């Protein structure tokens, strides 16, 4: 079915498994304990095994966290280093 | 206080002025004429110009693409390559 779905077990039981395998970003997806319905990802790294809420927004899609801006200019700088474009790589730079 | 702020100058306006300059990223901000009240943005990019929707959130952050599945798989596979911990570099690995 799917190798990282081990549906519904406990976090405790994910940060048990997780600790042994032998490498950074081993994972899996389980079903919530506390707020059911939404998904949490596991998974190790160094001497830990985090944990990452699965949201979802308005219109459904999934996501564990997105890139947002404060002010303009915030946005701007950011995206003189990062594509303006989804599909193109546009880097902001002065005019002029 | 703001170099690449042009306020309110015509979408048309702004590619006239913006088609001039010679750099791939060359860019400005200002108030949508189609929208009165919200920012766009203006990049000159190959032999054209292209435009932004500043777009806003329920929470009022500035923002212009984001990056969302729609399925969880998509969201897996992406965060192979990307980290999903937004301070830490932190990459999926399947389990053994
Ligand atoms: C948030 As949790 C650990 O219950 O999935």
């Given at each position: 079915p799917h190798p990282w779905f081990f549906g519904k077990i406990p976090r405790a039981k994910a940060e048990e498994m997780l600790?042994?395998?032998?490498?950074?970003?081993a994972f899996l997806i389980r079903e919530s304990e506390?707020?059911?319905?939404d998904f949490s990802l596991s998974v190790k790294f160094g001497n830990d095994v985090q944990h990452f809420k699965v949201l979802r927004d308005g219109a459904g899609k999934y996501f564990l966290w997105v890139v947002k801006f404060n002010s303009l200019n915030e946005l701007v700088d950011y995206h003189r280093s990062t594509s303006v474009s989804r599909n193109q790589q546009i880097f902001l730079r002065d005019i002029e």
């Open positions: 600790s042994k395998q032998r490498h950074d970003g506390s707020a059911p319905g």
